[PDB]
A paper describes a structure:
The ClpXP holoenzyme is composed of a hexameric AAA+ (ATPases Associated with diverse cellular Activities) unfoldase (ClpX) and a tetradecameric serine protease consisting of two heptameric rings (ClpP). Together, the ClpXP complex acts to unfold and degrade protein substrates (Baker and Sauer, 2012). ClpX uses energy released by ATP hydrolysis to create a pulling force that unravels folded protein domains for translocation into the degradation chamber of ClpP. Here, we present cryo-EM structures of the ClpXP holoenzyme from the gram-negative pathogen Neisseria meningitidis engaged with a protein substrate.
Further local refinement and classification in cryoSPARC improved the density for ClpX and revealed two distinct conformations, at 3.3 Å and 2.9 Å resolution, hereafter referred to as Conformations A and B, respectively. The main differences between Conformations A and B are within the protomer that adopts the bridging seam position, and where the seam is located relative to ClpP. In Conformation A, protomer X1 is disengaged from substrate and in the seam position while in Conformation B protomer X6 is disengaged from substrate and in the seam position. However, these two seam positions are not equivalent: in Conformation A the seam is further from the apical surface of ClpP in what we designate as the ‘upper seam’ (US) position (F - dark blue), while in Conformation B, the seam is closer to ClpP in the ‘lower seam’ (LS) position (F - yellow). In Conformation A, the X1 pore-1 loop in the US orientation is disengaged, with the X2 protomer at the top of the spiral. In both Conformations A and B of ClpXP, there is clear density for most of the IGF loops that extend from the ClpX ring toward the apical surface of ClpP. In Conformation A, clear density is observed for only five of the six IGF loops, with weak density belonging to the IGF loop of the X6 protomer (white dotted line in Figure 2B left). The lack of density for the IGF loop belonging to protomer X6 in Conformation A is likely due to conformational flexibility and sub-stoichiometric binding of this IGF loop into the ClpP-binding pocket. In Conformation A, there is strong density for ATP and a magnesium cofactor in protomers X2, X3, X4, and X5, while the X1 and X6 protomers are ADP loaded, with no density for either the γ-phosphate or magnesium. In Conformation A, both the X1 and X6 protomers adopt conformations that allow the X1 protomer to move away from the pore in the US position and there is reduced surface area buried between X1 and its neighboring protomers X2 and X6. In agreement with this finding, the local resolution in the cryo-EM maps suggests that the X1 protomer in the US position is significantly more flexible than the other protomers.
Author numbering:
A (entry chain S), B (entry chain R), D (entry chain J), F (entry chain Q), I (entry chain P), J (entry chain O): 6 to 15, 18 to 198
C (entry chain K): 6 to 198
E (entry chain I): 6 to 16, 18 to 198
G (entry chain H): 6 to 15, 19 to 198
H (entry chain M): 6 to 12, 20 to 198
Amino acid sequence: YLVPTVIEQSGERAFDIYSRLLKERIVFLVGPVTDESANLVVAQLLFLESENPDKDIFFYINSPGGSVTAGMSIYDTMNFIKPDVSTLCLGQAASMGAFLLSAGEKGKRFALPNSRIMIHQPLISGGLGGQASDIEIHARELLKIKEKLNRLMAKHCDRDLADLERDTDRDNFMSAEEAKEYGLIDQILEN
Amino acid sequence: YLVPTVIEQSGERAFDIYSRLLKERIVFLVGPVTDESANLVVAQLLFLESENPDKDIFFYINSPGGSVTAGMSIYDTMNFIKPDVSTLCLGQAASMGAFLLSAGEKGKRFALPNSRIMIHQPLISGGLGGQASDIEIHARELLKIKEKLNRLMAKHCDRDLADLERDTDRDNFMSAEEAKEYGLIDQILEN
Amino acid sequence: YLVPTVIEQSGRGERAFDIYSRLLKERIVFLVGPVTDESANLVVAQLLFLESENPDKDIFFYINSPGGSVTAGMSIYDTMNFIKPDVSTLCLGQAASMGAFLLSAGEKGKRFALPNSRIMIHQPLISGGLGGQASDIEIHARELLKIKEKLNRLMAKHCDRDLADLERDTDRDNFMSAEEAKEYGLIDQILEN
Amino acid sequence: YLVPTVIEQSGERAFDIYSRLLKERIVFLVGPVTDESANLVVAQLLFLESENPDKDIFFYINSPGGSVTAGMSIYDTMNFIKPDVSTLCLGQAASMGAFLLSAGEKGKRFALPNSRIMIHQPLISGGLGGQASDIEIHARELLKIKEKLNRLMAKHCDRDLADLERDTDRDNFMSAEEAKEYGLIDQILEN
Amino acid sequence: YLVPTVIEQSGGERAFDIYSRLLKERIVFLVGPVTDESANLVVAQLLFLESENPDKDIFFYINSPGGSVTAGMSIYDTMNFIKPDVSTLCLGQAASMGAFLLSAGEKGKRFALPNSRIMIHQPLISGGLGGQASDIEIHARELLKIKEKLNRLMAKHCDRDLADLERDTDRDNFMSAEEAKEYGLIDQILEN
Amino acid sequence: YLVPTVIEQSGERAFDIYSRLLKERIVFLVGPVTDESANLVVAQLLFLESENPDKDIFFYINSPGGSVTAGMSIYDTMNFIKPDVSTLCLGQAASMGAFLLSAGEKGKRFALPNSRIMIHQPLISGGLGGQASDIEIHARELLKIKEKLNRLMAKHCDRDLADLERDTDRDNFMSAEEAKEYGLIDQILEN
Amino acid sequence: YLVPTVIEQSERAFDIYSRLLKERIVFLVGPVTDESANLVVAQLLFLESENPDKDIFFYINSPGGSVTAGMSIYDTMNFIKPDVSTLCLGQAASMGAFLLSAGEKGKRFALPNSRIMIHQPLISGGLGGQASDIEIHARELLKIKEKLNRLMAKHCDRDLADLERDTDRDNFMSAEEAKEYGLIDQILEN
Amino acid sequence: YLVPTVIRAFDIYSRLLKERIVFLVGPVTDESANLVVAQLLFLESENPDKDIFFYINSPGGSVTAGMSIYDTMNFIKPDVSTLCLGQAASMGAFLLSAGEKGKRFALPNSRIMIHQPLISGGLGGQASDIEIHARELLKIKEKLNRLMAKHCDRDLADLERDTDRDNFMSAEEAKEYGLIDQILEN
Amino acid sequence: YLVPTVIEQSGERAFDIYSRLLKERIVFLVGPVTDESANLVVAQLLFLESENPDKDIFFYINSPGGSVTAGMSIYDTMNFIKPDVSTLCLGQAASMGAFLLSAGEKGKRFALPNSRIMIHQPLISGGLGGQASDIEIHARELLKIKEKLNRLMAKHCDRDLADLERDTDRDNFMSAEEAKEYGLIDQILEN
Amino acid sequence: YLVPTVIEQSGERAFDIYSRLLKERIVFLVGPVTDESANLVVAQLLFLESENPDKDIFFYINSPGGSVTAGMSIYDTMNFIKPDVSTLCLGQAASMGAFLLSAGEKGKRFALPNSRIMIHQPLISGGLGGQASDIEIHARELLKIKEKLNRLMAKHCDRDLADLERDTDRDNFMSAEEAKEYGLIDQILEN
């Protein structure tokens, strides 16, 4: 894709439109969460903290999910850095995208009216081949991740761990209103 | 493709021709609607609101359709931002392209005389594999999307939900005149 | 594979069979591997043939199958229930999915499993793809749910259990030993010697 | 697959089990309807008429559908030959399989209790490439086939053509009881 | 596919595959595409049947989408050469060379079943047209000669003008059994 | 390909050679007509109108054809914008390329002496799969497009619709002289 | 394909091609390959043994094939004592036309709508390797080209110069044109 | 392969079946396992008292397929003697050890390998599905070690150590371990 | 490939080496003639005419051939523009490359001593599939192109059309001396 | 690969390292000889002649061979331009690479001590398919090229044509010392 160039008035500085929005403390997570796309989010979050530790960071999420470890690098960076990270769901926040949406600062988690939010237990975090001993190890690691994600989700949503265990058993699709009632987001934007 | 470079008189500034048209508040949606192409539209819509919240934005659509969630990120951005988003159909506006065309500000939805506008119920928003329980969930989510799109279309067109349910059952191709009579567009441009 | 040839002794002469035709002569029908239109129709052809050879004698239906098509399995199932002779079922190796269904479909009191066999029951997967328009996907989703309910209902009947029990237990792949299948109600006895 | 061999008592004659059942006037249509599988059915129907024109022929159907022209070769052979062709649905009779099921002699069309019968308008009878003139021709031929199949179905079922046009619009799945009520079969066998 | 075996009663018993049994009754099937191999089997059967009985009719059952022109012409010339009349019957479909061979049956003995589909059209590629413009010219000329030959023989079969077949074979011309009868491709439509 | 850089004397400005020719109001349509290549032509046509609404735009066409909807986006832009769009055929103008050639301002449609111009009815505007009902819809849409293109061609050429229907039935190749006599172009350039 | 079985009264059950071989009919159908050519040779040798005096009927429906494979048939036809009559069904192209013309003079036939095509050979094998290897293979192909034109000219009672012109590019002939050319002697009708 | 005919005319494997010799050659599949079962059933009837000779040259295969053989061997009345030719690995070693105690043989240069099972089927889907398949694989692992330990007259703890990774044994080591009873020479 | 950068003394201007040679009025046609490579030649020829209509343009050809329509866009541009286009054969000028070589201004067509020039009738200008009617049309168009190319070649070479028809029947390879004697080039350069 | 950037002291000018070495009149031929890689060498040779017709050009060769026509474009350019072209073998000079090495100015052809020089008759200059008449033509053209290359090699090496015909029959590998004794190079560099 061709990324448009925009001019900032200050003299003038030419930006690509995403660098221009980063200047406004807007970080996008678009598409699958990968090591590379997650590390760019982390780099942007770290950079924005240095620019101004007190101002909010706006983390716009339009993602079907992705790697758990990659999503956790974002998650821990969001919680670590001093400035509040506000999260906004555009289009969809599914799987780790929903996790990172719910991970925003409480009171500053938003969704657009027709966005779709989906929460579910993790799938393969990696293949389970090799010997039964190797398969046992990877099955145990996946269960620990499953419990960790449900526990952190339950914390984000102010719900019991038992509720998240039921609700993430199979793909649980929610409207913005249902996500608000559930506790994944705080507000729904209109204008 | 090689994107031409044009010179803006002000000193001089060299733009690619799409960045030059963005300076005139023209945003293009060309080809399939994807997370990446939809997020560029959103980034441009957000940027243009900041530049001037009062001036109209011109959203030129030549698209066969694409992802619903990606199209909804555009749709909610169009409705959220203060400036009116005028929509123009070039070549075709099909599926989510027709939805976004109809989503323009009422009275400012345009089509060119020989453009083709097609509305239809959604197809797979994602595969339906796994167990019958998973297939049930995805079938239910697709039906909710189907109803949401028909409901929003009916609102755009000032028609009954029952009319959109009939008319989107199978691919419904319309000339610019038929789209105007239907309520998808307001005017047809000639000169 | 090369299927061995065996000689059946009759009066002053010998008939040469492949070993599976020889076992069919003893009223043994094998369902081995996936259930397909072709493998299911051979079972049906054998069941029909055996009923006529002797409507009163039991038929022995040996099952070693991971599952397969529901409609193909239902052609066997309805043939088993229709024909006059009792169809005894035996699980060798495994009876999974429609293989477990056909195992449980044997004549009550004559459903067997070998001691180390594995029996697995679960809700059906795709009976066919769900593409096309949302209207087509709705239709296929509804048909799959009707099949799901039909299979759980027939399973519950076979096992003398409540439909609610089969709905829980077939939600995800439910693996059972021969003893667990006997306690569940899928089989009646476990053979040893 | 290995087709078992069975011995007929008469001296003795060794048959494959399908030739043995043909001796009992049982003809199987299993799997897709193709030129080759349809011509075997025709060859068997012809052969059985010569053996005994007065005795019924039993046509066992377990088929997802197939070619219309191939199915029509069976259909016309069934109607032409003197002996009644009784039809039985095993597992499924879908598309042309349902057509041939309904084409059995009225009063002798059977289904097993858990069989599945599906009727629908035809899909591509052949690709529609080439020039718009060629596409027009193939579209017209497909519509003529569509009307012919609905008309013959309506005749088989003692229903109005308008009913079959509604009901074959999209895949219409029926239980044996629903097929009996519809008019596709006459009886449901149990024992 | 498994081809069933049937038993013929005679003076003893003989076991046939069902197609060899029908050949014994002078029924020759052309099913599926016309290829060198499928066409040569038809020719071998036509030659064999002439020798068995030169006076009795041969019944040539056609269910074919078309195929090679040269392969179809080997059948066509064999049909016309051998003494016994070759009656033709359309089952399912007779398209392209299948329709040609259907129309090539003995006049008065060309049949179709009521719901059969008969399609006539000009030939497509009889072979690729690559190489040099000189080679392409040659193959284009050969294809046009074949086109004219097929329309001329069709017009003869149908008792129509060559000009009519040239119009009607320009694009795929689908006909019901009734339309094929009116056109002149078949003589009768069977019902019972 | 490496696109040469040329220097414009004014100070100096370095252009790629196509941006340099755009500065002279020359727009190229080279190769297949796609959404992307058509939208660049539209962007250039819109840009040139803004630069000078009165001066002619020179639209150089060397194209085998392409998408109808993409070509129609160019076509409607050509007719909409105030400045005359002169069209020149280089090498070939086939299918939608011939349509856009004939769409130039009457009296300003040119071809080079050895160019090749080919007009024909459209092929598939999209596949015709699915159910016979879907195939009927797409066949009807293709016929409407066929009629629309012949009608607009007949208007461009000052011919009867009946003439274009004959002449576009199969690929109709024309020399520049034959295209001039037909009415697709007005003049043939030599020097 | 399923090859029908027929019963010969004498009973003996044959596949229909073995039944026609009993009548001294040998088929060459499809491409000429080492395997299909060797079956023709085996049948020609067998038939000479059964009766050295009776004609053999060699039915040809072939687009062409290998030259060496076709030459094994050709030399067998010329060697064995009984005349080999040749008939063109459908088509006789390339080596198929060569073998058609190779039939006994006066006994080369074609059916009325058959197509006969003669042309210079294409690659008898690839020409890779070094320029020295390419030179060798080019020379061998030219020798084959000359040999085929020379034998064709002999079959047709024409000058070598005529075959060199006429085989330059694919030369398609009707049965009548092949008869006038000299590839066949008669055209059968009934 | 062309299977020789020996003199009624038998193929050489049907001829050896007449001598109560059943071959398991190559991978254990549903189809190859069911032929062994069909042959074992057939031989029991031809003579319930005479030994059956089960010649094994197999790298392993499906557990469920191997268990159909295993249960048939234990069920039928006649003793099933087992002989290792070339190799008996994985389920092939299991079926070798499953022969009648005192009648399990190996040829001198044969190779016998025992190991825990690998995937009995893929582990995709949701973590809940992966948990189920991991549990089923562990139950199979324990069942195989338990039956192996019974065959070998060893503790379950010994088989759990020794099957952790591919454990290759000579015929002598397999005899000392308890997988076979004797080694044939002449 | 990495295209070297060279510095022009004037201040200094950095060019890629091909843009530097374009500044000297040298246009390269290297490799196959395609719509894209032909349009760059046309763009360069048009540009150079504007820079100086009187000075010669040097068109260096090292090409195996390519599309006829693409080559004709170059050919007509060469003949149209006022400045003489001198042509030089480097390595090879085959098929349309030989045509464009011979198309240079008479007296200014050059070849290097060990260059190879090959002339031949065209091959497929496009596939010949579809119906015999479509194949007839494409065969006729190819023959018209064949005659046009031989006629223009004969004009370039001052030979009879009959000579070019013989000589282009099969690939006709010529040394620079043979091409000079034939009439394809005027001179052979040495130093 | 990332091509390093180096700074030239003059103010400062940043070059990629190959453009920097071109400034020193060093032209590299690395890897296979293709139309594109050969034309860059030609462009560089032409450029360097213009910069200084009298100074030597250093042509560094590390090439396994390639196209003959492409190599001949270099060869004729080397011989045409006024400045001597010195050639140096690095790593290897095989096939046309050895030809171009031997083509350097007599007395200025160099090789590094452990370089490998291989001479051989050409392979396929293009495939030999089609008809025996086409194969004859291509075989004749290949033989003419073979003779031309041996003749030019013999001239370069001051040997008889008969010697090169023997020695190029099969791949003839030479050390730098053997190439010097043969006559392919004049000197071997050490320090």
